[PDB]
From a paper:
The fusobacterial trimeric autotransporter adhesin (TAA) CbpF binds to CEACAM1 on immune cells, resulting in downregulation of their activity against tumors colonized by F. nucleatum. In contrast to Fap2, CbpF is a homotrimeric type Vc autotransporter protein, in which all three protomers together form a trimeric passenger domain that remains exposed on the cell surface after expression, and a C-terminal β-barrel domain that serves as a membrane anchor. The ECD of CEACAM1 comprises an N-terminal, membrane-distal immunoglobulin variable region-like (IgV-like) domain and three membrane-proximal immunoglobulin constant region-like (IgC2-like) domains IgC2-like A1, IgC2-like B, and IgC2-like A2. CbpF binds to CEACAM1 via a protruding loop (D142–Y149) and via H92 on the respective adjacent protomer chain.
Whereas previous structural analysis by X-ray crystallography only resolved the N-terminal IgV-like domain of CEACAM1 (residues 35–142), our cryo-EM structure, after shifting the center of reconstruction toward one CEACAM1, also resolves the following IgC2-like A1 domain (residues 35–234 in total). Although the ECD of CEACAM1 is highly glycosylated and our data revealed several glycosylation sites on the IgV-like and IgC2-like A1 domains, no glycans are involved in the interaction with CbpF. For CEACAM1, the residues with highest SASA differences (F63, Q78, G85, T86, T90, L129) are arranged around a cavity at the tip of the IgV domain where the interaction with CbpF occurs. While the IgC-like domains are heavily glycosylated, the IgV-like domain that is involved in interaction with CbpF is less glycosylated.
Numbering used by the authors: 35 to 234
Write the structure that this text describes.
Amino acid sequence: QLTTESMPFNVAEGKEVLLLVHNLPQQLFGYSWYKGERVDGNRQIVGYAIGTQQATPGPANSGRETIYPNASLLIQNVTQNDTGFYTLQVIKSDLVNEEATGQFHVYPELPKPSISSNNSNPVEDKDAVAFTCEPETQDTTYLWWINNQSLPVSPRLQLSNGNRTLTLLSVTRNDTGPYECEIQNPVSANRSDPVTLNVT
Ligand SMILES: *[C@@H]1O[C@H](CO)[C@@H](O)[C@H](O)[C@H]1NC(C)=O
Ligand SMILES: *[C@@H]1O[C@H](CO)[C@@H](O)[C@H](O)[C@H]1NC(C)=O
Ligand SMILES: *[C@@H]1O[C@H](CO)[C@@H](O)[C@H](O)[C@H]1NC(C)=O
Ligand SMILES: *[C@@H]1O[C@H](CO)[C@@H](O)[C@H](O)[C@H]1NC(C)=O
Ligand SMILES: *[C@@H]1O[C@H](CO)[C@@H](O)[C@H](O)[C@H]1NC(C)=O
Ligand SMILES: *[C@@H]1O[C@H](CO)[C@@H](O)[C@H](O)[C@H]1NC(C)=O
Ligand SMILES: *[C@@H]1O[C@H](CO)[C@@H](O)[C@H](O)[C@H]1NC(C)=O
């Protein structure tokens, strides 16, 4: 049961991903890595022939891919477009083909976000000011930080636009504190400048 493992599963842009191979048969004739779930000649990335110990790039090669004698495929200077499935073809000594599949995801290196307010001078007795992390990004998870702690879940803490927008239904002067926003993707995360609440 040939299997493939992508180490790491998630990779930031510009780094490299190494695909490992397990349960490799004892008798082998050659390997081949193809872009996509289907073994097709046009999608061949690289091939290796144990008999002649020759490694030859395929039509889909871009110079960033190298094949090791242990069937491991190394891709350097990865990019977002590389996110997809990869299939390994193993040719046994008897030339009967055995296939396997693997995948990995590429994610951007997010920047520190920013916060904007729809009201800059909250009314002390009550107000419905709204906060939002403006630099919207895909497949990102938003976290709101208040007073150096996670937001206390309460109905007064409304959320919108998924939860990229945080609205305090009823503000109070006791709510004064540092307001900070974080974005985290499967690979990286850091926070924004803490905004303050104005009252007197
Ligand atoms: C395969 O060979 C490369 C280069 O020596 C190495 O980095 C990698 O860990 C090896 N993988 C396995 C499963 O042996
Ligand atoms: C990585 O890819 C980018 C875009 O082609 C290029 O500008 C950069 O020089 C490459 N870096 C390396 C070490 O190959
Ligand atoms: C930290 O923020 C800076 C600038 O916004 C950005 O270059 C970097 O990708 C971020 N690093 C992490 C681990 O989130
Ligand atoms: C703007 O701030 C005021 C403060 O009371 C609030 O009533 C209103 O709902 C907010 N509108 C938006 C789009 O955030
Ligand atoms: C408080 O702020 C610091 C950064 O200034 C941060 O490292 C720390 O995790 C925060 N503490 C809590 C409980 O969130
Ligand atoms: C924000 O939206 C995401 C959607 O997956 C959810 O997982 C998360 O629990 C939400 N956070 C809050 C405080 O509602
Ligand atoms: C505000 O915080 C102070 C802390 O001593 C507390 O005594 C007071 O009851 C709070 N007022 C309201 C309206 O929550």
